[PDB]
Design a protein around this ligand. Structure first.
Ligand SMILES: *[C@@H]1O[C@H](CO)[C@@H](O[C@@H]2O[C@H](CO)[C@@H](O[C@@H]3O[C@H](CO[C@H]4O[C@H](CO)[C@@H](O)[C@H](O)[C@@H]4O)[C@@H](O)[C@H](O[C@H]4O[C@H](CO)[C@@H](O)[C@H](O)[C@@H]4O)[C@@H]3O)[C@H](O)[C@H]2NC(C)=O)[C@H](O)[C@H]1NC(C)=O
Ligand SMILES: *[C@@H]1O[C@H](CO)[C@@H](O[C@@H]2O[C@H](CO)[C@@H](O[C@@H]3O[C@H](CO[C@H]4O[C@H](CO)[C@@H](O)[C@H](O)[C@@H]4O)[C@@H](O)[C@H](O[C@H]4O[C@H](CO)[C@@H](O)[C@H](O)[C@@H]4O)[C@@H]3O)[C@H](O)[C@H]2NC(C)=O)[C@H](O)[C@H]1NC(C)=O
Ligand SMILES: *[C@@H]1O[C@H](CO)[C@@H](O)[C@H](O)[C@H]1NC(C)=O
Ligand SMILES: NCCc1c[nH]cn1
Ligand SMILES: NCCc1c[nH]cn1
Lengths: 331, 121, 321, 333, 331, 331, 121
């Protein structure tokens, strides 16, 4: 019965004008969206973007494509999409995106007897996500995907999440090592520009950075170097070579840790939480060496045990205060 | 989730300083707009400021008359209403705009509306 | 030939509204490169062979197979096979499109394409670098459900897989497996999936010994301070601080050459085991110097610390190997 | 229309989907390669880039013409209207056909029907390497190309000139940085697959790495460092802080050199020759500090040195012995 | 009424010659430009370029496309653009640009009954911006986008900013961490080449680098190391090991800071402000060690407290002078 | 009069055979070249290439395109280029090149009544430039662009620089931070291959590296470390810890400077000038420590002031000699 | 915003050195051009120099006669007029060219014109 199906489809496309939306000049065409999230491959702080792979499905009725006498849904080769009207959907905050092309264009067209068109695409998109790194790496980010009609206003087209809160599937599949997905939300609104009002759908995720890596890699070495710096205060004040060596070397160790670290992050003009911590730790170890200079300055140069004894208590206590204030402010 | 409280609506004929104090997720809503509502008339654009950078824009009526700026420490925006006129008699509202929420001028693009200081001159 | 194309329905699968089309699949893995644990991906070049029967292309004017070039590919209907876990893929078009069509007189079609694909592979780096990873290559129809297209591994797949001939720089293919998941059950319905599972084991890391061994003798170098006298205050302090300075360089320089993904790997765990030992050696002298104003602490540290490091090595190596 | 009619007549009744001599004798395609530039060889990726003038010559009796002129140098777009061999590179990873400012394709038809079809291609091909003698190693990077769909019974490949003259790589064309092209070997093979049995033409480029870079950057500083570690032997035993600082910082210097060499080193499981040299040099520096530990411990228990006197002689000799063993094993072959 | 609209549009395009501009052979066609700035994604000092995303709208009248009897503006599928004349607009200082293509070519065509064509594109461009880094990182840059007709002279085409100073929107949206947009300007002029005079529109931005990141990351460590170097002058002159160790180690710390730093910047042949500062700081710490050599040279080797006492004052005072001159010259 | 122009152009292209060059079978077609250099974006030592952006114009006569009765030059939409013969010009030493495509293909076609075709392209090319780095960074390079006919021999086509020495404009626009353009030259010759003799045009530039950056970044730190190493010779010979610490630390500082440096350069097997300098400086600081070993070896271990006194003079003098020989050989 | 002051217009028949001192945003205007205006005739290209690099070009009339160069320290350009002729009798002007402002030869491409030293011989 392949000649009959071929005839029916040929008839559908005979005189079909791709230039005109369904119901041109009439009420807007309602387009239902449905996303299946395959993956979020990457999240980049330095590039302020993320990479998403998804199955993007669009659902609308085109009465020009209605067919009778066939009680099936016709799955057609993806090349038929070039002979049909499709919505002019784009991702307003995308940086670079493509439809996968192996072994064929990852595209689907399914027609229904009533003229419903189910148009599916498999898309990888790099999309902008401005991040607030003031609390980094104890930060929570809101990365969105903004879906809009490019040229058709709300007079001509309308979007909705098909299935409401179930329109987006596969959020459980997202496996980012550095983030957990706390929540996702679906929004619908109209956005006004100089050229008119346009339909908008917004998918957003709340990403929460896992602290564990940073505690061990950046925070703990810093804490141990700062504590190490305090050993000087228990060393004899006559051991000038030993105590000056300890002060300098710890300072220089703190510089090597800092500079190495800075190859991992974007060139932001503001203070991250980690920058504030490392700057605090640097100041502590610097003051520990300066403490010896004061002891050195008056013992030989002009109580000495008293100044050391105060340092033995005041430095760890101040570091405890510093940590308390820091971790309360940021956690 | 943004909360906006506005204050400093006095009476002149003169220089005035409206203030607009924000609290909450202000990062997601980088733009603050000033509107004003005269009795009867539609809500009308006055000006807007980006929180980050202070990139400013004004309606013609208030161009070179009013001046907006901010301080990120307090999360506060101010409309410095200099050279006032009897046309400048309205309920001035503050509002927050999302990053991708459209043109500056259109109040329907804005989500979180301040109370609205009445100003008469 | 040309008459067949004239009456050929390209937009429709063979036997539409009937039994599903059987598609035989075969793979010839040419090479596997760019296995990046930082990006959680690997690059693979394969000769994908698809075999199916189309009665519309059956001919009887000769009993010889028709060897057609890539130009004829666009005319015929093709299964919409795609790689599920492919981040990016493309065809080789030099000097021509690497496609071939073999049309048997019965109607069986042999469709072979040479494609290079970057395939995502989720790798658990908990045991890194003593880790074994399993990567997959999922293949299924994008739009046609089980009622339209059914995939199955051809009998020839067992012989021309080519995975044995592969030589990987940092891994060895310990085993490979071909699996058929009949019911993927996507949103559109049931989609048969053919998946190739090959297990990758890091080649009994010796470059890791190039990193492990320097840490091993650095903590041994910290123990050298114990044999040094207590009077040599500048000497023992300098040895302690530089070892910490040297250890810090070793730990952080690895991260430059290691993936930046946030995960606690076994290589990291060994570094902090070494880090605390050299840190403990320096603070050990702090007690020794302070309590001087004896060598008993030095004598105890001269044997407890070498024994403690041996004990933690046994716990570390047994758990991760 | 003096030549327009001739071209139209040749294209009329011509099917590019059928090889010349279809159903009869095999189509013999003669190929020669002119390497315009030999691009950089990536040891980390085991690939090399190369720009060539890939020329293919064959006879098609369907396109023979009778006329005044003997050779018809036509436009590059004429290629799509005629049959061309489906030559592909088996080990090629990413190959690009240049399109500036026009498709870089040549197409000439002789009177008898001989066709010269050349194309400028940039080819990135797989070059597996055995980096066990690195950097004192030499590799043979091949280039295998053959038909993708036509087996031996349908099409065969031959070298247009002699096997030595078909591939021409000028010395000026050598764009290698750290390698030297010793010579090229040209061979023709035959492989089998499920599709059929195919003729494969292989070109092997024998590349010899130049060790001048690694000698100055890595070997010399490491040799200086271990010699510097041996200096502490000549220092008096009473200066404990001086010798202790000497040993610890030489190890620190060795770590910086060893870390720096890692960035250039490709990531392979097997240790390279340079890795062994660095590791052994690391042991010598470590042993130098251990030597002072024995000296300091022994003199304090008894509290010029016999250990120092032997170390002043044995340590320089044993490192020299290692160098002779190391260099002879690797610098040879 | 879709057959009527289809007929009208078919009639418009029947015999339409894309090769000929509107009013060919007559007065120039006036093309109004209008830009909506979506983002400035990146600014690169090393590549001397920036990346802009914008909605680029062109406005002109083509009397060949005038239609009657339909009181609507026709929004057409983007593929109709291939059947129309459009201006040959290009970006003279662009390095690499593309029209976004997902899910369709981000392109709009809107026709008006009088033959006005509204042609919109969503473009991402990497555009050249030569930067003067003499004052880096206290620098102000002028990055431009130069818009020109490629082949049509001012005899054939003219450009204007549609709306004057409102032709460019979305400058408030630009969120570059490292820069603030101080100002933007719109210019119109004619540019003469050997092939004739061409219309030009220029959009420029004034970017001001935020100092904050650099003070903390590069300036403050340098200041603290230089101050640290001075501690030597308060240490006993008999502490030869201690004082020589302090001098060297600080010098070496200053080298590690310098070399790490240099992976962030382009290979410019001139002195940035930060290069001048770091070179000054290096000289200070170098002189502090040389100061000890002088003390060392005469105390033992041949007042000693006098030389140290002068150093205790002259070094901090000179550093204060150095900083005063530096920060006045550059701020 | 648009129907008349449309008719004329249609007539020109009716039966036009793109396969045949103008004057096929006759004397060669003379093609005049003309380049306007927009930019040289990048010069890479590591990749041994440079990136050029230019306006590439070709000038020839095609008598098949001659038209009468229109006293204008016809500027046509760039898509007409696909219906015309154009030369098969390529860049023999290019690595990767493209014609800019936004908002349209940056291409021009201008016809003249006598059949002269003016074909312009805006091209960005990455082109090979083998560099002699033996004198780096005091080197002068000759980077060329080689322009040739791909398939047509000099029997069929000939190239010339249109305007002679003025055929290439915009050399003053080139703004490479790391290089100055000393000179450019235009050459014309025939190049013989196995397939015949082909026309060639060669544009070359002489690039001169600016030394200033390298003096400050690599040379001066090296000089200061080497001088610093000499301080040891003025320190008391009894200060064993101090003098051995100074020797080692300077050596290690010289290693950190060297290794950091090597991330900026290609993996060449030969000695650059800078490599020779750094290797010399390393040897000096190494000999300074070995000098102390000799002093150490005989004072305690077995004149001591004499050996130091000789070192105080011989080391700076040898470094002066080393610098003199070096900077004379290379400058 | 560029200011150009030119000086050194003397009288000869001979070697002369015109100088051209720039101040302001010279970075945005990397090219300096020399023009000359004879009484009656149109403004005529003489030569041009890039501030950065000193890439030079000359009109044929003055090719190998005149020589331009600069010093970036003072922000000064000089036309070294050697081998003078009675054709070289004009008001010589200095001007600044924008980076993207078109061909060297065309005075309409230039924005900021110096006063113009009269030179007669
Ligand atoms: C990341 O950050 C983004 C913002 O940048 C957050 O997105 C916001 O999400 C909230 C919901 O959580 C959105 O609020 C909703 O807006 C809808 C838009 O309505 C517009 O259009 C209708 C006409 O169609 C107009 O009538 C209306 O005035 C608006 O112009 C509202 O319709 C919603 O209202 C519903 O809920 C409210 C209570 O909240 C009820 O009172 C209503 O009756 C109705 O049921 C709702 O207010 C907001 O618009 C989004 N902002 C943007 C810019 O899109 C993300 O949520 C955040 N991500 C995470 C994970 O938190
Ligand atoms: C970044 O740097 C660029 C330069 O590289 C700056 O661009 C310049 O901007 C200024 C304005 O700020 C431009 O000056 C204006 O030029 C207009 C064009 O005039 C030309 O064309 C007309 C014919 O159309 C000729 O008659 C004329 O001679 C020129 O050839 C003028 O029309 C303007 O004149 C108006 O303003 C002046 C006062 O400024 C009045 O006196 C006039 O009456 C009139 O009202 C004006 O002179 C300049 O041309 C631009 N240069 C380039 C190369 O484009 C950017 O402004 C800068 N960015 C920032 C943020 O500062
Ligand atoms: C067709 O496919 C089905 C399902 O995979 C399989 O069971 C059957 O054996 C196949 N038939 C042939 C002839 O391969
Ligand atoms: N779809 C948004 C189109 C737009 C943006 N700005 C103006 N028009
Ligand atoms: N649209 C500028 C074309 C050009 C530049 N140079 C020569 N011709």
């Amino acid at each position: 019965n392949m000649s009959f199906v071929k005839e029916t489809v040929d008839k559908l496309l005979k005189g079909y004008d791709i230039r005109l939306r369904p119901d041109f000049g009439g009420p807007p065409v309602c387009v239902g969206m449905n996303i299946d999230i395959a993956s979020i491959d990457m999240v980049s702080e330095v590039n302020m973007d993320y990479t998403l792979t998804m199955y993007f499905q669009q659902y609308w009725r085109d009465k020009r494509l209605a067919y009778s006498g066939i009680p099936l849904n016709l799955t057609l080769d993806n090349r038929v999409a070039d002979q049909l009207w499709v919505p002019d959907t784009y991702f307003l905050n995308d940086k670079k995106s493509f439809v996968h092309g192996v072994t064929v264009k990852n595209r689907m067209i399914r027609l229904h007897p009533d003229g419903t068109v189910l148009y599916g695409l498999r898309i990888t998109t790099t999309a902008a996500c401005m991040m607030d790194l003031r609390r980094y790496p104890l930060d929570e980010q809101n990365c969105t995907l903004e879906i809009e009609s490019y040229g058709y206003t709300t007079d001509d087209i309308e979007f909705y999440w098909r299935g409401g809160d179930k329109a987006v599937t596969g959020v459980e599949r997202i496996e980012l090592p550095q983030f957990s997905i706390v929540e996702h939300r679906l929004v619908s609104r109209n956005v006004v520009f100089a050229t008119g009002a346009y339909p908008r759908l917004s998918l957003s995720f709340r990403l929460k950075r896992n602290i564990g890596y940073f505690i061990l890699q950046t925070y703990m070495p810093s804490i141990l170097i700062t504590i190490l710096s305090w050993v000087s205060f228990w060393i004899n004040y006559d051991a000038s070579a030993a105590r000056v060596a300890l002060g300098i070397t710890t300072v220089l160790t703190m510089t090597t840790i800092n500079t190495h670290l800075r190859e991992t992050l974007p060139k932001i003009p503001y203070v991250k939480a980690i920058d504030m911590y490392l700057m605090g730790c640097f100041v502590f170890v610097f003051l520990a060496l300066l403490e010896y200079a004061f002891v050195n300055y008056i013992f030989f140069g002009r109580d000495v045990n008293a100044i050391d004894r105060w340092s033995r208590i005041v430095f760890p206590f101040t570091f405890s205060l510093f940590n308390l204030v820091y971790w309360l402010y940021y956690v | 989730q943004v909360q906006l409280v506005e204050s400093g609506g006095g009476l002149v004929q003169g220089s005035l300083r409206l203030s607009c104090a924000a609290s909450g997720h202000t990062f997601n809503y980088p733009i603050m707009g000033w509107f004003r509502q005269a009795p009867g008339k539609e809500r009308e654009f006055v000006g807007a400021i980006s929180w980050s950078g202070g990139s400013t824009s004004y309606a013609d009526s208030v161009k070179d008359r009013f001046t907006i700026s901010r301080d990120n420490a307090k999360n506060t925006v101010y409309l410095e209403m200099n050279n006032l006129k009897p046309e400048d008699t309205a309920v001035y509202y503050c509002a927050a705009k999302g990053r991708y929420s459209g043109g500056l001028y259109y109040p329907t693009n804005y989500d979180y509306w301040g109370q609205g200081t009445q100003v008469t001159v | 030939l040309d008459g067949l194309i004239a009456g050929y329905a390209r937009n429709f699968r063979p036997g539409i509204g009937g039994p599903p089309v059987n598609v035989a699949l075969a793979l010839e893995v040419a090479s596997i490169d760019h296995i990046s644990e930082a990006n959680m991906e690997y690059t693979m070049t394969v000769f994908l062979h698809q075999s199916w029967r189309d009665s519309r292309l059956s001919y009887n004017h000769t009993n010889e197979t028709l060897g057609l070039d890539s130009r004829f590919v666009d005319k015929l209907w093709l299964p919409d096979t795609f790689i599920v876990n492919a981040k990016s893929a493309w065809f080789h078009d030099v000097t021509v499109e690497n496609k071939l069509i073999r049309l048997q007189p019965d109607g069986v079609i042999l469709y072979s394409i040479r494609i290079t694909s970057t395939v995502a592979c989720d790798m658990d780096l908990a045991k890194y670098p003593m880790d074994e990873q399993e990567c997959m290559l999922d293949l299924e129809s994008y739009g046609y459900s089980s009622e339209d297209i059914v995939y199955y591994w051809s009998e020839s797949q067992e012989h021309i897989h080519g995975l044995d001939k592969l030589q990987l720089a940092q891994f060895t293919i310990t085993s490979y497996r071909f699996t058929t998941e009949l019911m993927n059950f996507k949103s559109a319905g049931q989609f048969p999936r053919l998946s190739l599972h090959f297990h990758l084991r890091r080649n009994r890391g010796v470059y890791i010994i190039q990193s492990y061994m320097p840490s091993v003798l650095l903590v041994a170098m910290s123990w050298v301070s114990f044999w040094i006298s207590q009077a040599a205050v500048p000497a023992r302090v300098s040895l302690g601080i530089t070892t910490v300075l040297t250890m810090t360089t070793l730990m952080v320089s690895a991260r430059s050459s290691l993936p930046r993904a946030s995960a606690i790997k076994a290589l990291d765990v060994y570094f902090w085991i070494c880090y605390v030992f050299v840190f403990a050696a320096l603070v050990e002298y702090a007690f020794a110097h302070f309590n001087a104003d004896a060598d008993t602490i030095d004598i105890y540290a001269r044997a407890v610390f070498p024994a403690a490091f041996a004990a933690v090595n046994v716990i570390y190596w047994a758990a991760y190997a | 229309e003096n030549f327009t009619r001739i071209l139209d007549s040749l294209l009329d009744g011509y099917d590019n989907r059928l090889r010349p001599g279809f159903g009869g004798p095999v189509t013999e395609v003669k190929t020669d390669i002119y390497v315009t530039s030999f691009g950089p060889v990536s040891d980390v990726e085991m690939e090399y880039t190369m720009d060539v003038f890939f020329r293919q010559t064959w006879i098609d009796k369907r396109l023979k013409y009778d006329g005044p002129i003997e050779i018809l140098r036509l436009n590059n777009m004429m290629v799509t209207k005629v049959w061309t061999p489906d030559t592909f590179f088996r080990n090629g990873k990413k190959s690009v056909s240049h399109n500036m400012t026009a498709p870089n394709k040549l197409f000439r038809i002789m009177r008898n029907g001989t066709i010269l079809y050349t194309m400028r291609l940039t080819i990135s091909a797989e070059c597996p390497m055995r980096l066990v003698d690195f950097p004192m190693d030499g590799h043979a990077c091949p280039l295998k190309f053959g038909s993708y769909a036509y087996p031996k019974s349908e099409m065969i490949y031959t070298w247009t000139k002699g096997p030595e003259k078909s591939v021409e790589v000028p010395k000026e064309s050598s764009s290698l940085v750290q390698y030297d092209l010793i010579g090229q070997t040209v061979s023709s093979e035959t492989i089998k697959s499920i599709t059929g049995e195919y003729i494969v033409m292989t070109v092997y480029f024998h590349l010899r790495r130049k060790m001048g870079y690694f000698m100055i950057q890595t070997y010399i500083p490491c040799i200086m460092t271990v010699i510097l570690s041996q200096v502490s032997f000549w220092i008096n035993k009473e200066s404990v802080p001086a010798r202790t600082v000497f040993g610890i910082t030489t190890v620190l210097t060795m770590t910086t050199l060893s870390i720096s060499a890692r960035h250039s080193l490709p990531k392979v499981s097997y240790a390279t020759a340079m890795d062994w040299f660095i590791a052994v040099c690391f042991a010598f520096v470590f042993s130098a500090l251990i030597e002072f530990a024995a000296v300091n411990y022994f003199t304090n228990i008894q509290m010029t040195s016999k250990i120092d006197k032997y170390a002043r002689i044995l340590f320089p000799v044993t490192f020299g012995a290692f160098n002779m063993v190391y260099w002879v094993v690797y610098l040879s072959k």
